[PDB]
Amino acid sequence: RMLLTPLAKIIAHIREIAG
């Protein structure tokens, strides 16, 4: 779960900043 925890953010932190 150490691969989905830190990625859980970027998973949506790149769709709002870039669209």
Q: What angle do CA 18, 8, 19 make, to 5 degrees?
A: 15
Cα(5)–Cα(7) distance, integer angstroms: 5
For the chain, give the longest Cα–Cα distance. Answer: 27
Q: Which two tokens stand for residue 5?
A: 């925890």
Cα(18)–Cα(9) distance, integer angstroms: 14
Name the strand (E) or helix (H) holding 10. Answer: helix 7-13
Cα(19)–Cα(9) distance, integer angstroms: 15
CA 4 to centroid of chain Cα atoms: 9
